Design a protein around this nucleic acid. Sequence first.
RNA 1: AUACCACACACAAGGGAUCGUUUGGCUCCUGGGACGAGGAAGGGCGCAGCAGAGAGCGAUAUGUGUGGGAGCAGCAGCAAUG
RNA 2: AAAACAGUGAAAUUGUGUGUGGACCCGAAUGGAUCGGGCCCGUCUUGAAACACGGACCAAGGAGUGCACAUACACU
RNA 3: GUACCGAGUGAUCGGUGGUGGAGGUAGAUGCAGAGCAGAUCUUGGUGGUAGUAGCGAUAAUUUGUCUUCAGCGGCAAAGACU
Lengths: 51, 89, 135, 131, 154
Amino acid sequence: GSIKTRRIKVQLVSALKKNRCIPQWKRACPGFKQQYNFTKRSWKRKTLKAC
Amino acid sequence: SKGTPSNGKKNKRNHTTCCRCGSVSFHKQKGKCSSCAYPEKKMKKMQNRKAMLKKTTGTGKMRHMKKERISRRAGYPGNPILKEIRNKI
Amino acid sequence: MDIVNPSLSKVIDIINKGKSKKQFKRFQSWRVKRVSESWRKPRGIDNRMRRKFGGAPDMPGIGYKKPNAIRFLLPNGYRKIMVACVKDLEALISLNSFYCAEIRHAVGSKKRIEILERAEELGILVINKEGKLVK
Amino acid sequence: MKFNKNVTASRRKNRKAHFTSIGLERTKLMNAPLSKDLKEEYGIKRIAVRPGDMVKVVSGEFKKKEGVVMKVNRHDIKIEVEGCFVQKEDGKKINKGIHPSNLRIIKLSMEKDRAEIINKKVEAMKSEVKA
Amino acid sequence: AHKYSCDISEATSVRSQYNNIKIKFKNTREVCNIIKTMELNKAIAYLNDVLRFKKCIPVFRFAKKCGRTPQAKEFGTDKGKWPVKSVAFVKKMLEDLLVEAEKKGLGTSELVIKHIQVNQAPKIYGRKHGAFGRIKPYNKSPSHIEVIAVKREH
RNA sequence: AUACCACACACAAGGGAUCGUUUGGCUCCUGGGACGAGGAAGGGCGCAGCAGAGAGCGAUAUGUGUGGGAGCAGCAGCAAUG
RNA sequence: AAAACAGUGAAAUUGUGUGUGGACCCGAAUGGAUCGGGCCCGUCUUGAAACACGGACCAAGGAGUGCACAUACACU
RNA sequence: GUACCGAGUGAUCGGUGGUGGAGGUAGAUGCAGAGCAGAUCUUGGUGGUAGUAGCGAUAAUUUGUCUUCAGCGGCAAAGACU
Ligand SMILES: [Zn+2]
C-alpha cells in the first residue's frame, strides 16, 4: 500500500532494477555462452518477501 | 472450516528483515531473530553441521583476511614514505 | 565361391544335408519384448518347460552334440584359422590339407593385397578373398 | 627422465596450465622459428610473431605461400596472413587463421620496441655463455 | 534440404512440405487419406464442397463414436465429419502447387496426387486445474506435411 | 476385410541408450596452520560508453612506485606521451 | 534440483509403401482348403490356469562385501 | 549401430554390404563396485483407452459500420440488468 517504511522502499527499488533480460549486444561476443537470464521474475508467479 | 476458508484470514506478518543477518526472520513481538539470536551478543547455536557450514568464514568475501596474508608474505613492509619510523622501531 | 576340400569331395553333401537347423529360443521371448532370444534355463516352481510336459518346447543338452569328426567343419570341408599378418600364414604351411584362413575384419586394403600375394605362392585357401577389395 | 619432484607430469595439470595462461606466459605461445640467414644476422633462434613481419607457411592448405602478418589473436591462438582466405557462398572472403608453429620468419618488422627486445635477449645469453 | 519419403523424378513432378503447423494430427490424416490418387482439380472442387457442408470427409481409423450421415454413402460407409480448420489449410497448400505447375511449364491439367503423408510433431505442453487440489495435462498435438503431384502418362 | 487389428522389411518421424572424449570429483602423502576496538567474520547498497546475473572494486569505485613490454575478444573509440 | 560435445544416434511408440495373417508357440507339409500337441508367468504352499497376491510398455541403474579372532582342507 | 549369411548342445563367437569418422584386439597371468523380467523397485521417455469424457450456476442479446486480417476488438443505434 501507500504507507511504506524506508527499509521496505529500498528493497522494492533494488528488486525492480535487477529484473531485466540480457542486453542484445552481449549475444554477439565471442566468449559468451548464456541463453536467457534465469534470475528474471514475474509478480504473478513469485513473492519478494519484502512484507 | 479448517481448510480453504480459514486461509482467507491470513493477512498479518510476524517476521521482518533482521539488521544483523538479512534473513527475514526477526519476530517483532518477541523482540528476537530466529536465525541469529539478535539482540544477544553471540550468534545462535546452529542445528547441524550441514546447516552451519553454509555460513562459515570463506562463504563470503574475506576482504581483510586476504590482504593480511599478502602483507605477511611480503614481511609487513608498510608505506615507503615512512621507512625511517619502521626501522627505528 | 564353389570350392571343396578334396578329401571329402564325394561326401560333403551328405554331411551338409545332415546338419540340424533347430533353435533353442528362451521361453516366453515371443510374449514380451524385454526378454531376449538367448537361452536361459527355467527355474520356476510351476514352469511347464522345466517339468517337460508334452507340447512345451525342447531344452538343450548333451544328446544333441555332433560327432567328433564332423564338428567345427565349414560347408566347404575345411576348419578355419584367423590371420592378421604375413607372418601368420607361415603357421599353416604344414596344415593346409584341412585348415583354411580367414583375414580379420580390421585389416585394411593396402595390407590385404600383401596377404593375398603370399597366400597364392604358399598354396593356402583364403575364404574372405573378395572382401572389401572388390572395387 | 625427470628427477625434480616439484614439476608435474600429470596430463590434467599440463593441459590446464596451457589454456589458462596469461601475461608473459601467453606471449611464449606465439613463438616461431627464424630462417637460416636471420639466425646469422641476429643471435636469436625464435621470436614472437608481430604484425607487419613476413612469413612462409610450411604446413597445411596454404603451404609454400608467403605474406605479411595482418593480425594476432591471443585468445584463440591464431595468426592471419595476407592472402590466405576462403570464399563464402556470397563471394565474400574470410581470412583463415594459422597456428604460430606452422610458420617461419623471412623478414622482421622493426617498428617500435623490437630492437630493444632483441638486444635484451642477446645479452641474457652471453651473460651465462661466457662464464 | 529435406528427404521426401519416396523417390519420384524432379522433372514431371511438383512438391511442397511444411513443419510444425498447428493443425490437429488425427483430423489431418483422415483428410489426406481420401484425396490420395485423385486429380488435382477434382481435389480442389471436393474440398470447396466440404467447407459449405454440401459433402463430407469419411472416417476409418480415427472414428470411434462418430456420427452417421447420408453424405458418407458416396464412399460406402455411414460415418463422416466436417473438419473445417484442416480443410482450409490443405486447400491453400494444393492451390499453390497449381501456381508452381503453371510456372514450371507443365499443364494445369492431367496432374494427379501420387504421394501425401502426415507425421506427428512434438507436443506443446499445457495444464488444467482439477478437484481435490490436483493438476492435469492439457497439451496440443501439431503436425508435419508432404505432397508430390505428377503428370499422367496417359 | 477395399479401408479395421496384428506381424516382417525399406523410407520418413519420436526419443536420447551405446561407443569414442573430459581445464571436474575422490583417496593417500608432504607443507601450512597466517582474524578482531588500527572495527573482524557475516549481511546490505553503489561503481562500466553501450551492462541483467556472476567476477573485480569502494564516491581516489583501473590512483602511485618498481620489473617487464603489444595490443584492448563484439560495435564504436583508445594505445611506445605505454 | 536439473542441465557436457551445435559427434554417433539403439528400443518403446507413429505415418507411408510392399508383402503375410486373424492372439501366439512347438512338430509336419501343400498350387490350395490346414492337421496333431499346448491354460499365464514369477511366488509362498500338502496342493495354482485359478473367483490367491505382484506385473500397461521400452532403456539405463539395481542385492553374500571388507576387517579381526580361532578352525578343517588344497598348495609352498 | 543396422540388415543378411556361416560356426557351437549352449552361454556366445566370426564374416559380408550400407552408416560412422578416431581408435582397437588375440594368448598367458593379476585385481574386482563383474552378467536381471519381476522387488505396489529408482530415474527418464512413450502407449491403449480417445478426437472420447468434458469445456455452458449468475443479467441476454441483435443490427449496421470500420479496422483486424479476420478479435461478439472499436464506434453508432436498439434491447436488458445490478
Ligand atoms: Zn538475524
